[PDB]
Structures are given as structure tokens and as C-alpha cells.
Design an enzyme around this catalytic site. Structure first.
Site, PDB file in Angstrom:
ATOM      1  N   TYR A  60     -20.222 -40.493  17.934  1.00 33.05           N
ATOM      2  CA  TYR A  60     -19.382 -40.017  16.849  1.00 33.05           C
ATOM      3  C   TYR A  60     -20.271 -39.505  15.719  1.00 33.05           C
ATOM      4  O   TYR A  60     -21.215 -40.185  15.331  1.00 33.05           O
ATOM      5  CB  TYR A  60     -18.564 -41.205  16.358  1.00 33.05           C
ATOM      6  CG  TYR A  60     -17.598 -40.898  15.240  1.00 33.05           C
ATOM      7  CD1 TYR A  60     -16.440 -40.188  15.426  1.00 33.05           C
ATOM      8  CD2 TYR A  60     -17.825 -41.419  13.985  1.00 33.05           C
ATOM      9  CE1 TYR A  60     -15.507 -40.002  14.411  1.00 33.05           C
ATOM     10  CE2 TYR A  60     -16.909 -41.261  12.950  1.00 33.05           C
ATOM     11  CZ  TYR A  60     -15.781 -40.507  13.155  1.00 33.05           C
ATOM     12  OH  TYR A  60     -14.858 -40.293  12.151  1.00 33.05           O
ATOM     13  N   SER A 130     -22.683 -44.711  22.161  1.00 41.14           N
ATOM     14  CA  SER A 130     -21.682 -45.018  21.149  1.00 41.14           C
ATOM     15  C   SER A 130     -20.304 -44.613  21.676  1.00 41.14           C
ATOM     16  O   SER A 130     -19.919 -45.052  22.770  1.00 41.14           O
ATOM     17  CB  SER A 130     -22.146 -44.390  19.868  1.00 41.14           C
ATOM     18  OG  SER A 130     -21.470 -45.012  18.776  1.00 41.14           O
ATOM     19  N   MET A 131     -19.507 -43.839  20.954  1.00 38.21           N
ATOM     20  CA  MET A 131     -18.257 -43.394  21.528  1.00 38.21           C
ATOM     21  C   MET A 131     -18.470 -42.617  22.831  1.00 38.21           C
ATOM     22  O   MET A 131     -17.579 -42.565  23.658  1.00 38.21           O
ATOM     23  CB  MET A 131     -17.485 -42.502  20.547  1.00 38.21           C
ATOM     24  CG  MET A 131     -16.881 -43.270  19.422  1.00 38.21           C
ATOM     25  SD  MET A 131     -15.751 -42.224  18.491  1.00 38.21           S
ATOM     26  CE  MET A 131     -15.315 -43.295  17.117  1.00 38.21           C
ATOM     27  N   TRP A 155     -19.095 -47.918  22.293  1.00 37.53           N
ATOM     28  CA  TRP A 155     -17.967 -48.232  21.423  1.00 37.53           C
ATOM     29  C   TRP A 155     -16.704 -47.763  22.090  1.00 37.53           C
ATOM     30  O   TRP A 155     -16.603 -46.619  22.540  1.00 37.53           O
ATOM     31  CB  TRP A 155     -18.183 -47.543  20.065  1.00 37.53           C
ATOM     32  CG  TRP A 155     -17.196 -47.892  18.965  1.00 37.53           C
ATOM     33  CD1 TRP A 155     -17.387 -48.787  17.944  1.00 37.53           C
ATOM     34  CD2 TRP A 155     -15.856 -47.378  18.792  1.00 37.53           C
ATOM     35  NE1 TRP A 155     -16.282 -48.806  17.128  1.00 37.53           N
ATOM     36  CE2 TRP A 155     -15.330 -47.964  17.612  1.00 37.53           C
ATOM     37  CE3 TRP A 155     -15.045 -46.482  19.493  1.00 37.53           C
ATOM     38  CZ2 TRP A 155     -14.050 -47.651  17.132  1.00 37.53           C
ATOM     39  CZ3 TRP A 155     -13.805 -46.162  19.005  1.00 37.53           C
ATOM     40  CH2 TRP A 155     -13.302 -46.770  17.844  1.00 37.53           C
ATOM     41  N   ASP A 175     -26.679 -54.608  16.549  1.00 32.03           N
ATOM     42  CA  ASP A 175     -25.728 -53.529  16.310  1.00 32.03           C
ATOM     43  C   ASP A 175     -24.592 -53.993  15.401  1.00 32.03           C
ATOM     44  O   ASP A 175     -23.891 -54.971  15.715  1.00 32.03           O
ATOM     45  CB  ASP A 175     -25.215 -53.099  17.692  1.00 32.03           C
ATOM     46  CG  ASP A 175     -24.542 -51.749  17.681  1.00 32.03           C
ATOM     47  OD1 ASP A 175     -23.961 -51.355  16.638  1.00 32.03           O
ATOM     48  OD2 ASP A 175     -24.584 -51.072  18.738  1.00 32.03           O
ATOM     49  N   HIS A 207     -27.921 -49.974  16.368  1.00 30.30           N
ATOM     50  CA  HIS A 207     -27.058 -49.065  17.090  1.00 30.30           C
ATOM     51  C   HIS A 207     -27.781 -47.758  17.397  1.00 30.30           C
ATOM     52  O   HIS A 207     -27.382 -47.036  18.316  1.00 30.30           O
ATOM     53  CB  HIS A 207     -25.841 -48.760  16.217  1.00 30.30           C
ATOM     54  CG  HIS A 207     -24.794 -47.973  16.920  1.00 30.30           C
ATOM     55  ND1 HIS A 207     -24.059 -48.490  17.961  1.00 30.30           N
ATOM     56  CD2 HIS A 207     -24.339 -46.725  16.688  1.00 30.30           C
ATOM     57  CE1 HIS A 207     -23.164 -47.551  18.336  1.00 30.30           C
ATOM     58  NE2 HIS A 207     -23.354 -46.457  17.606  1.00 30.30           N
TER      59      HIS A 207
END
Length: 258
Positions: A60, A130-131, A155, A175, A207
Site C-alpha cells: 500500500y 504488505s497488502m 497484511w 512490525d 515492516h
């Protein structure tokens, strides 16, 4: 015996640097493709062989440059790697899944000739940050023909993914964006018990550990992709009886070790 084996017998140290294949890059403009935002293809050159393909999603707000080191790193060990840009930097995890699907279809069907020449379209995998790691889990659920999936500090608001695709998750201990207790670890635990799965947790890491050269991420990502995309059992040794001071946790159901 195994027609998909590439490169010399591995050592751990070799998997912390770029590998034996020279890397070519191709920039895919946003307007040239449908269903995703373009990106950069990292692929072997100076070779007549073919290799599996990997589509990789950033996270993201990020763009493909945030995973350039890893696209290059993987390609240099013998993979065709498309690191996508998304339609919007703000796209969510399930949108990133759809865009990885589009990117894989692109790689197999509309990539430049020099890229297509290096690709075995029957051997594909996904990875993402992540996303983009949430999208990796989702596409693995949607597409059981994928060989492997590597979510990096993933995520997602959904925690249970029903996939049979072999998954190796990298968590970052410290994270605070996608805390491992809420994201990576639930993801690992909730995968089917019958799906080959690994969780590695980087000691002391944030992260953004996946966004710059990282020895542990390199070792585990290369090794999981080699084992599953190439059926290359020379890489089992890095994934079984794992003894690595960079890791503060390591969990597996050991389906790939027996």
C-alpha cells in the site's frame, strides 16, 4: 533427471547475493496493459534456457521500485519476475490479487518476445509485500495451479485462506504496520494443515525489511521458489532443520522435509 534444475549446487552464502544469471529488465508502461499498472520485468539474459515465472506485488502506497532488489535477486537465480505497479498505489489486498492474476496472464500471453522466450508458462508463482502479501494469499486461494506463494510481512483483514499452494510467510518481529500476532501468524496457522507451509520471523525487523537487500528474505524466497517452481530438491536443505540466527521464530508442518 529434473529438467527444471538451473544453476550450480547452492550454498547459503550464494543465496545472499545475486546469482549466476545476468539480469535483463523490461519496463511495462501502465497504459500498455489492462488489469494492472504495468511494472518491471527482471529476467535472465545470456542463457538459452527457460524458467518459471513469478508475479510480485508491492504494498500500500508503494511502487515496484520498493521490491526492485528482490525482483533482480530472484531473476539472477533463474526466474522471470514481474514486479507490478498497481492501478492505484492505494489499491487494497484483494485488488492486488486481481492485478497479480492479470500480471500472470500478461506474462504468459503478451510479454515481449525476449521475456516470453525465457518463460515456462506452466510453472508460475506469486509473492508480495504488505497488502501485496495479502493479495498473494488471496490469489493462492483463487488459483491452485500456482506452484508457490511467498507473502512478505503480509497484511489482510481476512485471516483464513483456503489454498493448497505451498506458502512461506516472512514475518518481521517488530512490525507495527502488519503486526505478526494479527497478520502473519494467523495467516500461517489458519492455512490448511495439509498445505505445505513455513513461517519465518525476522529478528528485530520492521515492516519495511522486505524493501531493501535482506539476506534471510533472499535465502528463504529463493529456496521456496526453487523447491516448488523448479522441483529443485537441492534447496530443501535451506528449509529443513533450519538454523539461522537472523530468525527469532520458525514454524512449519514439515511436509517438504520428510
Amino acid at each position: 533427471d529434473n529438467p527444471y534444475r538451473r544453476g550450480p549446487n547452492p550454498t547459503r552464502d550464494a543465496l545472499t547475493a545475486d546469482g549466476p544469471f545476468k539480469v535483463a529488465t523490461y519496463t511495462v508502461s501502465r497504459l500498455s496493459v489492462s488489469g494492472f499498472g504495468g511494472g518491471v520485468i527482471y529476467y535472465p539474459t545470456g542463457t538459452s534456457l527457460t524458467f518459471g515465472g513469478i508475479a510480485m506485488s508491492p504494498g500500500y502506497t508503494a511502487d515496484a521500485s520498493s521490491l526492485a532488489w528482490l525482483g533482480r535477486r530472484l531473476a539472477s537465480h533463474g526466474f522471470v519476475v514481474l514486479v507490478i505497479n498497481t492501478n492505484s498505489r492505494f489499491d487494497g489486498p484483494d485488488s492486488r490479487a486481481s492485478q497479480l492474476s492479470a500480471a500472470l496472464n500478461y506474462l504468459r500471453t503478451r510479454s515481449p518476445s525476449a521475456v516470453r522466450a525465457r518463460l515456462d508458462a506452466n510453472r508460475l508463482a506469486v509473492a508480495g509485500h504488505s497488502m501485496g502479501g495479502g493479495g498473494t494469499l488471496r490469489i493462492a486461494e483463487q488459483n491452485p495451479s500456482l506452484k508457490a506463494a511467498v507473502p512478505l510481512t503480509p497484511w489482510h483483514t481476512d485471516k483464513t485462506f483456503n489454498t493448497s499452494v505451498p506458502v512461506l510467510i516472512v514475518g518481521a518481529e517488530r512490525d507495527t504496520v502488519a503486526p505478526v500476532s494479527q497478520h502473519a501468524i494467523p495467516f500461517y496457522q489458519n492455512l490448511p494443515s495439509t498445505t505445505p507451509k513455513v513461517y519465518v520471523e525476522l529478528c528485530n525487523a520492521s515492516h519495511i525489511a522486505p524493501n531493501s537487500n535482506n539476506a534471510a528474505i533472499s535465502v528463504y524466497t529463493i529456496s521456496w521458489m526453487k523447491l516448488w517452481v523448479d522441483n529443485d530438491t537441492r534447496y530443501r536443505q535451506f528449509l529443513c532443520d533450519v538454523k539461522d540466527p537472523a530468525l527469532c521464530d520458525f514454524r512449519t508442518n514439515n511436509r517438504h522435509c520428510k
